[PDB]
Design a binder for this molecule. Structure first.
Ligand SMILES: [Cl-]
Ligand SMILES: [Cl-]
Ligand code: NA
Ligand code: NA
Lengths: 4, 182
């Protein structure tokens, strides 16, 4: 999971 | 007022999606809106854009929408709804493509667009000063700090570094292109  | 229709509809859209994510959980909404994570999803064409409508944390939706409201709102008022539309389409698509190339498709968030707006407004003001768009000294310090925060991951979760690089690049390049005109 990655924020964009 | 302040918010043109494009600025407004994006804010509404991000809020509606965020609510859906609190009710259903993040991954159920990723299943529908994320960049295609399975070959069978490659023709669902909204996915190349709708990754930008999802936020995993309250603090990131608030700051993204604040920057979007301010810079997005400025671009729309001074340059038109359509200009904001194309910046948004291009930054969402290229930032998502660069992000999944480096790290896969499990990403989301408007910053890619926010980074393009920051670079766009700043560079356009620096090169084409009196088209009516510029980033004041103070705010660009706070944009520079926001950018440094993401690069060195001073935030909660992992940062989408490729989205974030591609979005800024898109913004500076469109501002350069728009600066050649006069
Ligand atoms: Cl407003
Ligand atoms: Cl990354
Ligand atoms: Na975000
Ligand atoms: Na960010």
């Amino acid at each position: 999971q990655y924020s964009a | 007022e302040r918010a043109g229709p494009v600025t407004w509809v994006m804010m509404i859209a991000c809020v509606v999606v965020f609510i859906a994510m609190q009710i259903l959980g993040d991954q159920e909404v990723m299943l529908w809106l994320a960049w295609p994570f399975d070959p069978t999803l490659k023709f669902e064409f909204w996915r190349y854009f709708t990754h930008a409508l999802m936020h995993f944390s309250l603090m990131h939706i608030l700051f993204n929408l604040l920057w979007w409201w301010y810079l997005g709102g400025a671009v729309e008022k001074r340059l038109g709804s359509g200009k904001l539309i194309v910046i948004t389409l291009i930054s969402a698509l290229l930032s998502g493509y660069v992000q999944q190339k480096f790290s896969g498709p499990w990403f989301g968030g408007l910053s890619g667009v926010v980074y393009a707006l920051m670079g766009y407004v700043w560079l356009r003001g620096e090169r084409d000063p009196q088209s009516g768009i510029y980033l004041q000294r103070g705010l660009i310090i706070f944009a520079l700090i926001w950018i440094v925060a993401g690069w060195f991951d001073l935030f909660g979760m992992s940062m989408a570094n490729g989205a974030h690089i591609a979005g800024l690049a898109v913004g500076l390049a469109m501002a350069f292109v728009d600066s050649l005109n006069a």
